[PDB]
Design an enzyme around this catalytic site. Structure first.
Site, PDB file in Angstrom:
ATOM      1  N   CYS A   1     -27.894 -51.755   0.316  1.00  0.00           N
ATOM      2  CA  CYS A   1     -27.087 -50.792  -0.226  1.00  0.00           C
ATOM      3  C   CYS A   1     -27.806 -49.566  -1.200  1.00  0.00           C
ATOM      4  CB  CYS A   1     -26.221 -51.587  -1.364  1.00  0.00           C
ATOM      5  SG  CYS A   1     -26.910 -52.061  -2.822  1.00  0.00           S
TER       6      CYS A   1
ATOM      7  N   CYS B   1     -34.776 -33.427   6.190  1.00  0.00           N
ATOM      8  CA  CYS B   1     -35.912 -34.282   5.808  1.00  0.00           C
ATOM      9  C   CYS B   1     -36.066 -35.478   6.815  1.00  0.00           C
ATOM     10  CB  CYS B   1     -35.970 -34.789   4.343  1.00  0.00           C
ATOM     11  SG  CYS B   1     -35.716 -33.136   3.188  1.00  0.00           S
TER      12      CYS B   1
ATOM     13  N   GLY C   1     -44.107 -45.992  16.383  1.00  0.00           N
ATOM     14  CA  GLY C   1     -42.747 -45.301  17.153  1.00  0.00           C
ATOM     15  C   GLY C   1     -41.558 -45.255  16.586  1.00  0.00           C
TER      16      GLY C   1
ATOM     17  N   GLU D   1     -36.460 -28.495   9.467  1.00  0.00           N
ATOM     18  CA  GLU D   1     -36.886 -27.717   8.371  1.00  0.00           C
ATOM     19  C   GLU D   1     -38.217 -27.883   8.032  1.00  0.00           C
ATOM     20  OE1 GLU D   1     -33.762 -27.895   5.675  1.00  0.00           O
ATOM     21  OE2 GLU D   1     -34.871 -27.228   4.033  1.00  0.00           O
TER      22      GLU D   1
HETATM   23  C1  LIG Z   1     -41.349 -37.268  11.891  1.00  0.00           C
HETATM   24  C2  LIG Z   1     -42.251 -38.173  11.129  1.00  0.00           C
HETATM   25  C3  LIG Z   1     -42.066 -38.270   9.638  1.00  0.00           C
HETATM   26  C4  LIG Z   1     -42.867 -39.206   8.978  1.00  0.00           C
HETATM   27  C5  LIG Z   1     -42.942 -39.331   7.434  1.00  0.00           C
HETATM   28  C6  LIG Z   1     -43.447 -38.115   6.841  1.00  0.00           C
HETATM   29  C7  LIG Z   1     -43.609 -38.293   5.418  1.00  0.00           C
HETATM   30  C8  LIG Z   1     -43.363 -39.518   4.668  1.00  0.00           C
HETATM   31  C9  LIG Z   1     -42.813 -40.622   5.448  1.00  0.00           C
HETATM   32  N1  LIG Z   1     -43.012 -40.541   6.899  1.00  0.00           N
HETATM   33  C10 LIG Z   1     -43.329 -40.489   9.770  1.00  0.00           C
HETATM   34  C11 LIG Z   1     -43.479 -40.314  11.069  1.00  0.00           C
HETATM   35  C12 LIG Z   1     -44.065 -41.433  11.754  1.00  0.00           C
HETATM   36  O1  LIG Z   1     -44.156 -42.621  11.561  1.00  0.00           O
HETATM   37  N2  LIG Z   1     -44.869 -41.197  13.001  1.00  0.00           N
HETATM   38  N3  LIG Z   1     -45.406 -41.948  13.973  1.00  0.00           N
HETATM   39  S1  LIG Z   1     -44.982 -42.499  15.249  1.00  0.00           S
HETATM   40  O2  LIG Z   1     -43.394 -42.679  15.154  1.00  0.00           O
HETATM   41  O3  LIG Z   1     -45.429 -43.433  16.041  1.00  0.00           O
HETATM   42  C13 LIG Z   1     -44.998 -41.039  16.445  1.00  0.00           C
HETATM   43  C14 LIG Z   1     -45.962 -41.160  17.582  1.00  0.00           C
HETATM   44  C15 LIG Z   1     -45.905 -40.192  18.635  1.00  0.00           C
HETATM   45  C16 LIG Z   1     -45.129 -39.142  18.342  1.00  0.00           C
HETATM   46  C17 LIG Z   1     -44.326 -38.846  17.344  1.00  0.00           C
HETATM   47  C18 LIG Z   1     -44.294 -39.980  16.452  1.00  0.00           C
HETATM   48  C19 LIG Z   1     -42.722 -39.317  11.699  1.00  0.00           C
HETATM   49  F1  LIG Z   1     -42.590 -39.307  12.957  1.00  0.00           F
HETATM   50 ZN   LIG Z   2     -27.219 -54.275  -2.518  1.00  0.00          ZN
END
Ligand SMILES: Cc1cc(-c2ccccn2)cc(C(=O)NNS(=O)(=O)c2ccccc2)c1F
Ligand SMILES: [Zn+2]
Ligand code: NA
Length: 268
Positions: free
Chosen positions: A37, A140, A151, A174
């Protein structure tokens, strides 16, 4: 003093940025968050008592995707305001550029969960403006640190585009993106565009993928797969050059795939 450490589910996570939790919460050594939650708490005791009480075992809203133990919940900001505010405060701990936490009514939130016998554990989310004038299909996007580079972010990116397809539109995240969001989108755009080129104009790729043409072009420029002719970007690639980029090491991790079959969502 600001929130600098949280306990959510079975994880402790250090903060990256200031998040505007109330003043008395920041003062604490850490914040305790119910993983279902998203209630935030000041003490381990109140947290432990809540875990005994909370009957939530999954996000609110509607489960619009489920394949095996991967699930996406869609949550309208106006229908579930407290929950979405908590989500935003949680996300601002890891997002520098996010600015909107309490005005959640104009957004819908897509919550990624990994399910087991005890419940649907939150992994990350993306928000999306109900009507985006600038045509952004993600506002976001945030993967919690223990789940990053595994992944899930790629899954959520692919998912935002599957929604853009169902809406018969193109979209782009964005800006500005985090350093990790930039790399994640660039890697995803490459993957998708290279796979289509191996299996076509820039307008065709755009309609097939819901990636904007600007995003396609800039990705192909960095791949050096575009010619310029009399003011128009033109796709200049050979079937082997594509395979050379694809079978290279930076695309070798098996994705969690978005199965359109399992996406129960109608465009409004
Ligand atoms: C769009 C995005 C944002 C953030 C993020 C930004 C700020 C604060 C917290 N999180 C993390 C990931 C993530 O975890 N990327 N790694 S991935 O999934 O393995 C992967 C592998 C190959 C191609 C694409 C993605 C992400 F995709
Ligand atoms: Zn809860
Ligand atoms: Na950490």
């Amino acid at each position: 003093k600001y929130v600098d450490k949280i306990h959510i589910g079975n994880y402790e996570i250090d903060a990256w940025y200031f998040s505007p939790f109330p003043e008395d919460y920041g003062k604490q050594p850490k914040l305790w968050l119910c993983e279902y939650c998203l209630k935030y708490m000041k003490y381990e005791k109140s947290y432990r008592f809540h875990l005994g009480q909370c009957q939530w075992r999954q996000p609110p809203g509607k489960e619009i995707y489920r394949k095996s133990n991967i699930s996406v919940h869609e949550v309208d900001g106006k229908d579930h305001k407290i929950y979405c505010q908590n989500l935003c405060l949680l996300a601002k701990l890891f997002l520098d550029h996010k600015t909107l936490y309490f005005d959640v009514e104009p957004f819908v939130f897509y919550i990624l969960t990994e399910v087991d016998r005890q419940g649907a554990h939150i992994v990350g989310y993306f928000s999306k403006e109900k009507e985006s004038p600038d045509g952004n299909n993600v506002s976001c996007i945030m993967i919690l640190p223990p789940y990053q580079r595994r992944g899930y972010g790629r899954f959520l990116i692919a998912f935002s585009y599957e929604l853009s397809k169902l809406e018969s539109t193109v979209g782009s995240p964005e800006k500005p993106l985090s350093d990790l969001g930039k790399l994640s989108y660039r890697s995803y755009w490459s993957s998708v565009l290279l796979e289509n080129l191996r299996d076509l104009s820039i307008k065709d790729l755009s309609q097939m993928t819901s990636i904007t043409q600007n995003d396609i072009i800039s990705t192909l420029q960095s791949l050096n797969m575009v010619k310029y002719w009399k003011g128009q970007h033109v796709i200049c690639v050979t079937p082997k050059l594509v395979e050379e980029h694809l079978k290279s090491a930076q695309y070798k991790k098996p994705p969690i795939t978005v199965d359109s079959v399992c996406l129960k969502w109608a465009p409004p």
